[PDB]
Symmetry: C2
Subunit: 349 residues, 2 copies
């Protein structure tokens, strides 16, 4: 809308901005990537070279030093089964060409976040590759046996959050060496589907799944201002249950957090000892827009329709939201711009 | 040899004891398993059903409620590449049959330890499966290209220990459910090739690699009466990996293992590739904690099977200097003093 409609319905994808040029791809777009020059009079999505690593849901991407890097995601292995990837691809916009890097992340990456700090891509969060991949291996083995399927599901969902080993480590990828380093770790727990925002020496990790079907309303701050990385629990948002797949950006010096999806009542079920916290519940999509302004959160506006699992980009001191999924799991093609004209939010779509 | 010679030379294998019967297999024995009745007057190794998961180096095992469980190890995937496994097999000694369990450990398991506590198998340690598997994938892609091989090796070895993500988590496997749970995590770091000893609610993790080519002299104590303690180090300053550990008459023994003399110094001086150029040394040292050197093996030995037997430490097989696997077993007993039976 605020940009032309994406060429296909676009959920679970990824994207990046390099100054005034927006790049989007993957998710329900398959191997397709597109770019758009936001400063053109006749704004247009231009199809780029196809992603060579197959379709990916829940990949991330970072622009660093003129090149676009894509990390992980969920897709098919050589046997045709759903799995989590741990790879990195590089796209060179000057040559419209992709290469896969010889680079091995220590953890699979799906539901992870990625941000750029001091010329490096930093990654945290995501599901555990062995648990996630094993679920699909088991379902494949079960075939059409519903009793076998029920057993697999029962075992899978009846665990405490810690037993899913969501990634609490902080990893850094250096484009110059293509190597992965230990950068730190959360004193608390990892999530899958948190929203990330970075501004200078601060990064924020907002909500996310703590385990399959259970989200957190937590907000973590990573403070890189000192000699040692410091982690802080900030005031929560989207309480009590939290969302996953929300959108986030910074407008002025105030964080914007919008949308996301979740299961209402699930936190209370888990707190009450039901590990399978979302059993029987229907997924709902948030319309809330929260602003973190002068160090405090407030519900400041709303989206017209609930939305999760799209692309969030900084643009013109605003949060640019592109695509996503709405009620019924329907992918959308439109874009929204959330700007703060203090101390209040405005929404364009 | 204390027990009869193993039917084939036997390094990097695994084993367990259930009452009087010793079970050993894998490593350089391939898929073979054997058992021995330690009460027989003519002790012998009896061949069992072969392991169906292919050859495995650095697997572990636990005997729990009448069944033998085998965890992970290094072996070949469907396409012939070396990799780390995350699986569990169960051997029923009554039917002499194996089954692969539908069970998914959250980490690969090679260089891990395993011990039994309150009817569960506890696992910690080991390499990171993506880094380890990635290395062999890269060497497979490179082929005969020396330039590429050199680059792969340079990147692989030139990292800080923390960058290898050796497993510091403590995992528990419950035979009754076949599921894996979070049981805790080390306040320090994980290792590959630590020696483990459990007695009651206490477990000791001794030495091990902190990264490829660098060992630790650390000794950790897990107390389930879970609390994590760091004890006085042993095999300082460099440490070993693949050593043998046991308890004898309340004394904690640590024997053997292999290391690279001066690697810790190199690492401390900023050489990440801490063992570049060096030859492995295999230790004959035997230490008792009271740590005091108390005896000596006749030859350096690492990467065999350690078992508790008659209040002694039974060592079966292992690797020796130059890589030669051996077939003999050794018994180490502690009154405040060590005696090595060969």
């Amino acid at each position: 809308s605020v940009l032309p409609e994406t060429p296909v319905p676009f959920k679970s994808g990824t994207g990046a901005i390099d100054n005034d040029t927006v790049y989007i791809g993957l998710g329900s777009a398959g191997t397709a990537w597109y770019k758009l020059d936001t400063q053109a009079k006749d704004k247009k999505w231009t199809a780029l070279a196809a992603f060579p690593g197959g379709p990916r849901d829940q990949a991330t991407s970072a622009f660093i030093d003129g090149n676009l890097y894509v990390f992980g995601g969920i897709g098919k292995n050589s046997e045709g089964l759903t799995q989590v990837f741990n790879d990195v691809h590089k796209y060179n916009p000057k040559t419209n060409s992709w290469v896969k890097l010889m680079s091995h992340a220590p953890m699979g990456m799906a539901g992870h976040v990625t941000f750029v700090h001091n010329g490096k891509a930093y990654v945290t969060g995501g599901v555990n590759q062995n648990i996630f991949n094993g679920y699909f291996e088991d379902l494949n083995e079960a075939g059409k046996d519903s009793t076998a399927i029920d057993k697999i599901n029962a075992h899978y969902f009846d665990k405490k959050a810690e037993d899913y080993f969501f990634n609490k480590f902080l990893l850094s990828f250096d484009p110059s060496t293509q190597q992965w380093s230990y950068a730190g770790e959360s004193p608390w727990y990892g999530t899958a589907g948190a929203a990330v925002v970075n501004k200078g020496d601060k990064t924020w990790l907002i909500n996310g799944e703590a385990k399959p079907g259970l989200r957190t309303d937590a907000v973590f701050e990573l403070d890189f201002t000192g000699n040692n990385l410091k982690w802080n629990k900030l005031a929560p948002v989207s309480s009590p249950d939290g969302v996953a797949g929300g959108f986030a950006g910074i407008s002025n010096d105030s964080l914007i957090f919008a949308g996301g999806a979740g299961f209402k009542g699930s936190r209370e079920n888990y707190q009450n000892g039901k590990n399978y916290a979302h059993e029987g519940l229907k997924k709902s999509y948030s319309t809330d827009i929260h602003l973190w302004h002068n160090g405090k959160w407030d519900k400041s506006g709303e989206l017209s329709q609930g939305r999760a699992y799209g692309v969030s980009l900084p643009w013109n001191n605003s949060l640019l939201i592109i695509g996503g999924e709405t009620a019924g799991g329907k992918a959308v093609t439109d874009s929204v711009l959330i700007t703060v004209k203090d101390n209040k939010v405005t929404v364009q779509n």
